[PDB]
Design a protein around this ligand. Structure first.
Ligand SMILES: *[C@@H]1O[C@H](CO)[C@@H](O[C@@H]2O[C@H](CO)[C@@H](O[C@H]3O[C@H](CO)[C@@H](O)[C@H](O)[C@@H]3O)[C@H](O)[C@H]2NC(C)=O)[C@H](O)[C@H]1NC(C)=O
Ligand SMILES: *[C@@H]1O[C@H](CO)[C@@H](O[C@@H]2O[C@H](CO)[C@@H](O[C@H]3O[C@H](CO)[C@@H](O)[C@H](O)[C@@H]3O)[C@H](O)[C@H]2NC(C)=O)[C@H](O)[C@H]1NC(C)=O
Ligand SMILES: *[C@@H]1O[C@H](CO)[C@@H](O[C@@H]2O[C@H](CO)[C@@H](O[C@H]3O[C@H](CO)[C@@H](O)[C@H](O)[C@@H]3O)[C@H](O)[C@H]2NC(C)=O)[C@H](O)[C@H]1NC(C)=O
Ligand SMILES: *[C@@H]1O[C@H](CO)[C@@H](O[C@@H]2O[C@H](CO)[C@@H](O[C@H]3O[C@H](CO)[C@@H](O)[C@H](O)[C@@H]3O)[C@H](O)[C@H]2NC(C)=O)[C@H](O)[C@H]1NC(C)=O
Ligand SMILES: *[C@@H]1O[C@H](CO)[C@@H](O[C@@H]2O[C@H](CO)[C@@H](O[C@H]3O[C@H](CO)[C@@H](O)[C@H](O)[C@@H]3O)[C@H](O)[C@H]2NC(C)=O)[C@H](O)[C@H]1NC(C)=O
Ligand SMILES: *[C@@H]1O[C@H](CO)[C@@H](O[C@@H]2O[C@H](CO)[C@@H](O[C@H]3O[C@H](CO)[C@@H](O)[C@H](O)[C@@H]3O)[C@H](O)[C@H]2NC(C)=O)[C@H](O)[C@H]1NC(C)=O
Ligand SMILES: *[C@@H]1O[C@H](CO[C@@H]2O[C@@H](C)[C@@H](O)[C@@H](O)[C@@H]2O)[C@@H](O[C@@H]2O[C@H](CO)[C@@H](O)[C@H](O)[C@H]2NC(C)=O)[C@H](O)[C@H]1NC(C)=O
Ligand SMILES: *[C@@H]1O[C@H](CO[C@@H]2O[C@@H](C)[C@@H](O)[C@@H](O)[C@@H]2O)[C@@H](O[C@@H]2O[C@H](CO)[C@@H](O)[C@H](O)[C@H]2NC(C)=O)[C@H](O)[C@H]1NC(C)=O
Ligand SMILES: *[C@@H]1O[C@H](CO)[C@@H](O[C@@H]2O[C@H](CO)[C@@H](O)[C@H](O)[C@H]2NC(C)=O)[C@H](O)[C@H]1NC(C)=O
Ligand SMILES: *[C@@H]1O[C@H](CO)[C@@H](O[C@@H]2O[C@H](CO)[C@@H](O)[C@H](O)[C@H]2NC(C)=O)[C@H](O)[C@H]1NC(C)=O
Ligand SMILES: *[C@@H]1O[C@H](CO)[C@@H](O)[C@H](O)[C@H]1NC(C)=O
Ligand SMILES: *[C@@H]1O[C@H](CO)[C@@H](O)[C@H](O)[C@H]1NC(C)=O
Ligand SMILES: *[C@@H]1O[C@H](CO)[C@@H](O)[C@H](O)[C@H]1NC(C)=O
Ligand SMILES: *[C@@H]1O[C@H](CO)[C@@H](O)[C@H](O)[C@H]1NC(C)=O
Ligand SMILES: *[C@@H]1O[C@H](CO)[C@@H](O)[C@H](O)[C@H]1NC(C)=O
Ligand SMILES: *[C@@H]1O[C@H](CO)[C@@H](O)[C@H](O)[C@H]1NC(C)=O
Lengths: 342, 224, 147, 433, 49
């Protein structure tokens, strides 16, 4: 609300603001433009399937153990074990949850910063796709992958046994499919051990989801700066808008107020420009994440190092606050011998 | 974050200590002062502030006598060794008033009751710390203070910890102050400390009760 | 200028100069941000011209929903339209399948394609279209014992 | 309101932002300390004499009601100039520590009493700082204090070694030297007694006759008040939106009893944005929270205008129980009260949604409300029929379990060759200015 | 150095600048943000082994 940010609860300042007019409407339209882009980014990344696949009740896949990346029905939120770790690494500020005012005022008004931003007319809006609907799309992509491989990307999902899907993968990396079936218990034990280390890493270290926490910290820092800019005097007699109208005549109060209007309006123009530049950087990441959903989850990519270090086998998507985590599975050659060749 | 005259952290305060040994010296008062005494039974009783101290120009006085206070600014002629005599009230009490011979043109006076109460209930050798800040800024002399009853350090001094001085009083005295001096009773075992304020950006932490609870002196070192 | 002296007309005009100059600075910043967004689209459109028109791409869903065959570019005002042509598999049947055939102590695997059964017989077929073939030493290769 | 926001007579299908709703206050409130006596102003304005300006006299005014009007109505003392306030506000406002500085000077030197001035009267005996908050008052006294034999008991310091500080006073009477040698004792060559007198005789010329001056130097608006203008305290009120004033601190908000423990020396509390968000009441010593009155964004949800004129409204971030309390018995920013009737009200996680009916069955998302909810215009006739705005939790896609088994495969017996369009921008219009 | 750029070797201009304050710190933080990005870009391109 440019009016409540510039002219905080003042009638006569609001009438001086109208001499600029359209300048606030550009800000409102630009921030609405960013807000619709966030939903579009999330649709491009996660809504890559027009059907919601469920995994069958017999949870056997040739000995590969997806039970920690699939949904657990016992939890009230239908996220996986690894998604329920990721949701604890990224400490959010305000998912747009409605404030029933009694939670804004009283004890919490002494220390909570979200209510303090709201009282300056800065509001965080909720995403169209809730974290349960992102968990459902992520479950559909994963249930499709483990029951049908790349086929649900190119047409209707066609079932295949998971060990025969892994054989098709092995041929994809130029290793003949007998090398899977002759080693299947080892390949499964290696995969099950490698998934075990994802939980151990994410349960143990803080310095992992920094790429997502930085996005939250940038928005929190930019709004805290924009609240703090209300303290700026901009060469006026005071910051406090009331203490100008309470101490001057309408002829030179208009000089003291027009400074605060000019400086605060420039502070919003700076925030909207800084938000558009980040929204362009986040979009570029969403376009990459949608491309990795298509080429690493819905398919097998022969692109070197695009789907993780090695030769790409399969990838599994997991939701995270404001992001996506890909668990890429890669064949890496391990014990070489020297031979003579011709 | 605020810029004011504050005492720089880890700065050399000058340390004075009575016993038959006494130290009543006149000290400079440039920009303003932090004054503290670690004290029992009231030996320190107040201060003189001025530029000449011999009635050719005015000077300020603050005193806590037996049952009350005086605050006055006037063309005083101060006595060159100002003191009171009590010797722990052994056989006689307040009698002589060695502070000034004359008080000519006076331009403010005030009187109250016995300033600054002791700790309640006592404990074994349990002394108390009195802390003050004095500023002089475009005609106004501003006094801030604190009291903290705290366990005695023995070879040490001015004990480790943090606490903030509340504002006490504002006196509209209108005079140049350049020097200052302290008033004592005639034996005791009081010690006092003097530091100088300087302009310095301080970053203050307020807890949820709104007491200042920690601070950073932004010029102290690179980490600060 | 029709109502003031050069001394305070300069105060009334400098406002209009400051406000209008700030309006252009806002437009140029808003144009540079869009031009960066349009560029990113042109870099993608050139990449699709190279990988979907000048070639066939094995990248999943890059050249439209399906398996990419061919694409045809068409011009449009300020843009490009790609008509992507894709093979999409249409009428599936369930079959029983196996990873290997055991014949004579030796285990056999498909050279290309997969083993299938209609319920009584066994065949090799290519993976993406049902065209069954009798299982032979030309359709398959050997590795290891069946156990 | 959407037609005016968009500047169009036709609005396309969508959800649109419109002007934020804001609850207006139901009453004004004023609080001042109950000081009942009119201040001792006349105790200086009609009194024996004023001090010599080298030794100007300072009076502290406190625990009383200022009324500038009744004094100016009595007093022959026909002048004003202010620096930190307008004179028109002095009746409205209130003050912390108030000092009248009283002295006498020549009518032409009156200009030197303004802040930032210079000349020996301002340099050597009375100085105001650049940030002086107050006013200067002056009046001719020749009718009362000028004398034809002279009234030389008015004195001023003509000489000093350096310019004095703001609000310093200097009564020193030691000799001064313009000659470079030590003119000790009572006199010397080019050496002087530093105080002079004024030739105040009634037959003099204009601006040399005596003017009595008072400078009022009040502090205001951020410390516990002791002198107020003559307006009257109202009752206090809580939990309601009001135009409050405490000690001159005007603002619109809802007051509430607080557990913020202001220490005895404090009077106001402030937020990170440098604005007062609590204030102890000057009559009864409790701390009140100040919160801005209930407000939020208003989004209007419409089918295309050429499809229909019926629309729904989202009060974003607002608890639904607040909107029935937002009933237009008082003013609100949106004047269109009619949506308050509700009956089809739904609390979405994004806000209170009104005029759209919530239905249990999902659809593809038509207009996005937020937090999984979407709205659409359709014939709600599951069981005569009519179109209305419905609201629903969006479908993600068709439900489809996969027939996976540890030895089953599906293989396509036939194919479709499909052609799909994709559209990409390549350029935008070049522009020059 | 915004102080050095705006108020080039002037004491009293530097005290008028503080009435804006945070406005210079946004510039310093934004340019530091670009500077760390250049090293990251160079690591992503060349440090692939
Ligand atoms: C797939 O990998 C899973 C993770 O290693 C593994 O789950 C773990 O299985 C063990 C053995 O059943 C459980 O051990 C617990 O069993 C009961 C549970 O009530 C307790 O009484 C025991 O004291 C013991 O704690 C683990 O709790 C369980 N972990 C999780 C996260 O569920 C699966 O068993 C693996 N599946 C296959 C087919 O190997
Ligand atoms: C502590 O010292 C104070 C001064 O050093 C002293 O104040 C003195 O009090 C007496 C009695 O009230 C005053 O004496 C005068 O009182 C009125 C003045 O109009 C007259 O009726 C008397 O005849 C007499 O002139 C002193 O003037 C006053 N001195 C000052 C400078 O304030 C306190 O009484 C002392 N208190 C204790 C407990 O020792
Ligand atoms: C802010 O001020 C608060 C009010 O003084 C203060 O709360 C008080 O804290 C003490 C120490 O925790 C409590 O002491 C009691 O604690 C429990 C019962 O709660 C007993 O076991 C103890 O024996 C002792 O009696 C006070 O009860 C508590 N007062 C209230 C009203 O809750 C806060 O601690 C202060 N905040 C900070 C950061 O210091
Ligand atoms: C699975 O697919 C099989 C191959 O298409 C099919 O077997 C074939 O069935 C036909 C009859 O429908 C046989 O035709 C033969 O009929 C007699 C057999 O004695 C001969 O006189 C004829 O010359 C002719 O050979 C095919 O020969 C027979 N193929 C084989 C390899 O036996 C099965 O019927 C299909 N099974 C199911 C369950 O659908
Ligand atoms: C407050 O009082 C101060 C002392 O009374 C006064 O400072 C004094 O200023 C004079 C003139 O600048 C100095 O006179 C000497 O100046 C230099 C050495 O400082 C010599 O070259 C001269 O010949 C002469 O001796 C005093 O030395 C100086 N004293 C002190 C203690 O600073 C302030 O100016 C007064 N301030 C105000 C605002 O009134
Ligand atoms: C593979 O899919 C093809 C459709 O994409 C399908 O072609 C369709 O075949 C049916 C007959 O099976 C035709 O139906 C019409 O046939 C004649 C008129 O030509 C009439 O007697 C019928 O009533 C009916 O109208 C479709 O017209 C024809 N479609 C096309 C585009 O040719 C193939 O038959 C499928 N092949 C396999 C092996 O499944
Ligand atoms: C592959 O061979 C290199 C060196 O060539 C070999 O030299 C002989 C020792 C013998 O192994 C021949 O058959 C080869 O022609 C090995 O490199 C050496 O590695 C050791 C440590 O393992 C090191 O001490 C030597 O300095 C290396 N020498 C050189 C010239 O590089 C290499 O380790 C062999 N690879 C593997 C997988 O064993
Ligand atoms: C592939 O098979 C599944 C289920 O297994 C089959 O069950 C028998 C009926 C028989 O067909 C066996 O040879 C298979 O083992 C089919 O799924 C069923 O589909 C129908 C609708 O067509 C539905 O009513 C059932 O509830 C489904 N059952 C299950 C367990 O999913 C599937 O349709 C078959 N695929 C094709 C292309 O026909
Ligand atoms: C809107 O606010 C009302 C309060 O006015 C909320 O009602 C409260 O709900 C809690 C939890 O059930 C109860 O403990 C309180 O007693 C209720 N208070 C009253 C006075 O009704 C209501 O839940 C809020 N609605 C939303 C969606 O947050
Ligand atoms: C400072 O005080 C002295 C002494 O009270 C004053 O000197 C006397 O002033 C009165 C009134 O003008 C004269 O009648 C006496 O003759 C003076 N006595 C002496 C010995 O000088 C002096 O005027 C005062 N100064 C100020 C600035 O108030
Ligand atoms: C404090 O005083 C001592 C001399 O006694 C000196 O060595 C030291 O450097 C001083 N420190 C400061 C910060 O002034
Ligand atoms: C002025 O004050 C005197 C007392 O000093 C009083 O008697 C007189 O009536 C007053 N005159 C006016 C004009 O108010
Ligand atoms: C106001 O003043 C009257 C009398 O002076 C007193 O009785 C009353 O208590 C005062 N009001 C408050 C709130 O104390
Ligand atoms: C809108 O509806 C009107 C009829 O009410 C019709 O004439 C017009 O062509 C329609 N326009 C569009 C773009 O649908
Ligand atoms: C949705 O269905 C439930 C029963 O499952 C019913 O109680 C409820 O009234 C329906 N929702 C609405 C909005 O009426
Ligand atoms: C599938 O086969 C495995 C043996 O590999 C067996 O353990 C499991 O019970 C079977 N399940 C079904 C549904 O056929």
């Amino acid at each position: 609300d440019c009016t409540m940010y510039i002219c905080g609860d003042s009638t006569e300042c609001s009438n001086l603001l109208l001499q600029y007019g359209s300048f606030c409407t550009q800000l409102k339209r630009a921030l609405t433009g960013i807000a619709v882009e966030q939903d579009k980014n999330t649709q491009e990344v996660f809504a890559q399937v027009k059907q919601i696949y469920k995994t069958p009740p017999i949870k056997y896949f040739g000995g590969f153990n997806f039970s920690q990346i699939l949904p657990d029905p016992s939890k009230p939120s239908k996220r996986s074990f690894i998604e329920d770790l990721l949701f604890n690494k990224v400490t959010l500020a305000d998912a747009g949850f409605i404030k029933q005012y009694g939670d804004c005022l009283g004890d919490i008004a002494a220390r909570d910063l979200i209510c303090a931003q709201k009282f300056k007319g800065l509001t965080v809006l909720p995403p169209l796709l809730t974290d349960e609907m992102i968990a459902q799309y992520t479950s559909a992509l994963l249930a499709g992958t483990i029951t049908s491989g790349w086929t649900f990307g190119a047409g209707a999902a066609l079932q295949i046994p998971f060990a025969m899907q892994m054989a098709y993968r092995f041929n994809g990396i130029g290793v003949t499919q007998n090398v899977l079936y002759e080693n299947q218990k080892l390949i499964a034990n290696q995969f099950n051990s490698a998934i075990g280390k994802i939980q151990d890493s994410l349960s143990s270290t803080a310095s992992a989801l920094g790429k997502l926490q930085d996005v939250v910290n940038h928005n929190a820092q930019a709004l805290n700066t924009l609240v703090k800019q209300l303290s700026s005097k901009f060469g006026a007699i005071s910051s406090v808008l009331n203490d100008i109208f309470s101490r001057l005549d309408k002829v030179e109060a208009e000089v003291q107020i027009d400074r605060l209007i000019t400086g605060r309006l420039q502070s919003l123009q700076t925030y909207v420009t800084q938000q558009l530049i980040r929204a362009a950087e986040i979009r570029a990441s969403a376009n990459l994440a949608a491309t990795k959903m298509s080429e690493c989850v819905l398919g097998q990519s022969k692109r070197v190092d695009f789907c993780g270090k090695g030769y790409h086998l399969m990838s599994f998507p997991q939701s995270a606050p404001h992001g996506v985590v890909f668990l890429h599975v890669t064949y890496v050659p391990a014990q070489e011998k020297n031979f003579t060749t011709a | 974050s605020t810029q004011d005259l504050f005492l720089p952290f880890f700065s050399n305060v000058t340390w004075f200590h009575v016993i038959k040994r006494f130290d009543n010296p006149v000290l400079p008062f440039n920009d303003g002062v932090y004054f503290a005494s670690i004290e029992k039974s009231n030996i320190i009783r107040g201060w003189i502030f001025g530029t000449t101290l011999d009635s050719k120009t005015q000077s300020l006085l603050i005193v806590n006598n037996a049952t009350n206070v005086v605050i006055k600014v006037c063309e005083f002629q101060f006595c060159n060794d100002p003191f009171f005599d009590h010797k722990n009230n052994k056989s006689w009490m307040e009698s002589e008033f060695r502070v000034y011979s004359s008080a000519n043109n006076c331009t403010f006076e005030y009187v109250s009751q016995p300033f600054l109460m002791d700790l309640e209930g006592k404990q074994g050798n349990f002394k108390n710390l009195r802390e003050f800040v004095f500023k002089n800024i475009d005609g106004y002399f501003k006094i801030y203070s604190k009291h903290t009853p705290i366990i005695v350090r023995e070879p040490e001094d001015l004990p480790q910890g943090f606490s903030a001085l509340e504002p006490l009083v504002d006196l509209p005295i209108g005079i140049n102050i350049t020097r200052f001096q302290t008033l004592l009773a005639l034996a005791g075992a009081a010690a006092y400390y003097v530091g100088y304020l300087q302009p310095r950006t301080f970053l203050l932490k307020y807890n949820e009760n709104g007491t200042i609870t920690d601070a950073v002196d932004c010029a102290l070192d690179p980490l600060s | 200028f029709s109502r003031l002296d050069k001394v305070e007309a300069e105060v009334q005009i400098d406002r209009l100069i400051t406000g209008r100059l700030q309006s252009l600075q806002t437009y140029v910043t808003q144009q540079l941000i869009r031009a960066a967004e349009i560029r990113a689209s042109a870099n993608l459109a050139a990449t699709k011209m190279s990988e979907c028109v000048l070639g066939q791409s094995k990248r999943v869903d890059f050249c439209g929903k399906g398996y990419h065959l061919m694409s045809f570019p068409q011009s449009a005002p300020h843009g490009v339209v790609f008509l992507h042509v894709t093979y999409v598999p249409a009428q599936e049947k369930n079959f029983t399948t196996a990873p290997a055939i055991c014949h004579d102590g030796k285990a056999h695997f498909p050279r290309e394609g997969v083993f299938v059964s209609n319920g009584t017989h066994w065949f090799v077929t290519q993976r993406n279209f049902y065209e069954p073939q009798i299982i032979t030493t030309d359709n398959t290769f050997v590795s290891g014992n069946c156990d | 309101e959407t037609k005016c926001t968009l500047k169009s007579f036709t609005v396309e299908k969508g959800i649109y932002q419109t002007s934020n709703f804001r609850v207006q206050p139901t009453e004004s409130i004023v609080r001042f300390p109950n000081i009942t006596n009119l201040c001792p102003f006349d105790e200086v304005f009609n009194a024996t004499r004023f001090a010599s300006v080298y030794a100007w006299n300072r009076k502290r005014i406190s625990n009383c009601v200022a009324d500038y009007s009744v004094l100016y109505n009595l007093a022959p003392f026909f002048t004003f100039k202010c620096y930190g306030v307008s004179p028109t506000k002095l009746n409205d406002l209130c003050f912390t520590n108030v000092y009248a500085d009283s002295f006498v000077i020549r009518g032409d030197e009156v200009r030197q009493i303004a802040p930032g001035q210079t000349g020996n009267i301002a340099d050597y005996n009375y100085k105001l700082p650049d940030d002086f908050t107050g006013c200067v008052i002056a009046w001719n006294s020749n009718k009362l204090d000028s004398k034809v034999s002279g009234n030389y008991n008015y004195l001023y310091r003509l000489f000093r070694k350096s310019n004095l500080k703001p609000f310093e006073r200097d009564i020193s009477t030691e000799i001064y030297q313009a000659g470079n040698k030590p003119c000790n004792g009572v006199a010397g060559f080019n050496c002087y007694f530093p105080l002079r007198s004024y030739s105040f005789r009634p037959t003099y010329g204009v601006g040399h006759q005596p003017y009595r001056v008072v400078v009022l130097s009040f502090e205001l608006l951020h410390a516990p008040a002791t002198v107020c203008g003559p307006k009257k305290s109202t009752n206090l009120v809580k939990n309601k939106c009001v135009n409050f004033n405490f000690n001159g601190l005007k603002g619109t908000g809802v007051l509430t009893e607080s557990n913020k423990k202001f220490l005895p020396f404090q009077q106001f509390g402030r937020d990170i944005a440098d604005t007062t968000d609590a204030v102890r009441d000057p009559q009864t010593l409790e701390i009140l929270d100040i919160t801005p009155c209930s407000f939020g964004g208003v989004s209007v949800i419409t089918p295309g205008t050429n499809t229909s004129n019926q629309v729904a409204v989202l009060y974003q971030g607002v608890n639904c129980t607040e909107v029935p309390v937002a009933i237009h018995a008082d003013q609100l920013t949106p004047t269109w009260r009619v949506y308050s009737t509700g009956s089809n009200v739904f609390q979405t996680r994004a806000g209170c949604l009104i005029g759209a009916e919530y239905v249990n069955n999902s659809y593809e998302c038509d207009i996005p409300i937020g937090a999984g909810i979407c709205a659409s215009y359709q014939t709600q006739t599951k069981s005569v029929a009519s179109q209305s705005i419905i609201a629903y939790t969006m479908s993600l896609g068709a439900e489809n379990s996969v027939a996976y088994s540890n030895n089953s495969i599906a293989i396509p017996t036939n194919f479709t060759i499909s052609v799909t369009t994709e559209i990409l921008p390549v350029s935008m219009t070049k522009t020059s200015v």
